[PDB]
Design an enzyme around this catalytic site. Structure first.
Site, mmCIF file in Angstrom:
data_model
loop_
_atom_site.group_PDB
_atom_site.id
_atom_site.type_symbol
_atom_site.label_atom_id
_atom_site.label_comp_id
_atom_site.label_asym_id
_atom_site.label_seq_id
_atom_site.Cartn_x
_atom_site.Cartn_y
_atom_site.Cartn_z
ATOM 1 N N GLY A 78 -2.418 -0.432 -6.353
ATOM 2 C CA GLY A 78 -3.381 0.664 -6.499
ATOM 3 C C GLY A 78 -4.392 0.500 -7.607
ATOM 4 N N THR A 103 5.351 -1.057 -9.680
ATOM 5 C CA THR A 103 6.790 -1.058 -9.445
ATOM 6 C C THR A 103 7.023 -2.075 -8.353
ATOM 7 O OG1 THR A 103 6.527 1.344 -8.907
ATOM 8 C CG2 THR A 103 8.224 0.766 -10.677
ATOM 9 N N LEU A 153 -5.389 -15.054 5.034
ATOM 10 C CA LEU A 153 -5.876 -15.728 3.826
ATOM 11 C C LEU A 153 -6.915 -14.804 3.269
ATOM 12 C CD1 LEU A 153 -6.009 -19.066 5.784
ATOM 13 C CD2 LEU A 153 -4.564 -18.470 3.803
ATOM 14 N N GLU A 173 -2.970 4.203 -1.309
ATOM 15 C CA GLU A 173 -3.840 5.314 -0.885
ATOM 16 C C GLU A 173 -3.695 5.776 0.610
ATOM 17 O OE1 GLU A 173 -6.296 7.242 -3.990
ATOM 18 O OE2 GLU A 173 -4.637 5.785 -3.761
#
Length: 261
Positions: A65, A92, A192, A233
């Protein structure tokens, strides 16, 4: 010595090693400004500030994020000396950083993020607005950490891109810039970040069960709302246009990077 501003995600602050790592380097003669975010929009402000200083890199200290907030503001700079992006895995989960092989060792990571060879990479952008550097996964909801969603039911959509068209009910839609989403299983194992294509995987039902495709753009429509998780999001709606911004920013990446052609 190239100057750097580091944008720390408000959560991952407290981290004596990083503090001490920043001290070591600052006196070895590196400028490393630090700035801590409190909320949406902070990233962009401190990017702007990085530009003032004419810094070489902006470093996202965070998970996916924060990497997006920093990237999205990066890729919307007007002008000529846009800083590169550098990454410190402090989320995390750090799916994106793990998969480009950002060093686990905290000092080496900083070292990459400050000194690394920058390389142009692609961002993805949804409805000419929200961006993501890693993964978009979509479902009809309202499974688990598998994608910030809980009830997952199959439902109609139609999807298109260059020489790609599909229509049916679908359970999960993964459109990747990167390989692995939250948790860390390959949704698009051959993505990629520098081929200028998004990878699409459609999961049908509950190999004919998965449809695949690769395109610099995909349009998605559904009569009921789709819930896309874009690198954390949420975004809901019945119409998505996902487009690659080819080579939109420069990232300090390790030499061998698994996601470069």
């Amino acid at each position: 010595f190239p100057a750097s501003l580091l944008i720390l995600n408000g959560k991952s602050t407290d981290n004596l090693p990083l503090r001490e790592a920043i001290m070591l380097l600052r006196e070895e003669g590196m400028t490393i400004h630090v700035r801590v975010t409190w909320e949406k929009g902070d990233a962009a402000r401190y990017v702007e500030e990085a530009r003032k200083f004419g810094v070489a890199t902006v470093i996202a200290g965070g998970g996916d994020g924060t990497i997006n907030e920093v990237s999205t503001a990066l890729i919307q700079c007007e002008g000529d000396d846009i800083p590169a992006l550098g990454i410190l895995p402090l989320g995390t989960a750090n799916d994106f950083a793990t998969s480009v092989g950002i060093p686990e060792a905290l000092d080496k990571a900083l070292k990459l993020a400050i000194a690394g060879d920058a390389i142009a990479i692609d961002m993805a952008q949804v409805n000419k607005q929200t961006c993501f550097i890693n993964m978009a996964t979509g479902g009809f909801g309202t499974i688990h950490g598998l994608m910030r969603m809980d009830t997952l039911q199959p439902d109609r959509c139609e999807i298109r891109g260059e020489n790609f068209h599909w229509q049916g009910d679908a359970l999960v839609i993964g459109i990747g810039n990167g390989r692995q989403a939250g948790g860390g299983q390959q949704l698009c194992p051959n993505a990629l970040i520098n081929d200028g294509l998004l990878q699409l995987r459609i999961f049908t039902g509950d190999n004919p069960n998965i449809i695949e495709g690769a395109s610099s753009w995909f349009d998605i429509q559904a009569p009921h709302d789709i819930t896309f998780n874009l690198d954390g999001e949420p975004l809901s709606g019945q119409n998505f246009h996902i487009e690659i911004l080819p080579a939109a920013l420069r990232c300090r990446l390790p030499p061998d990077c698994p996601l470069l052609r």
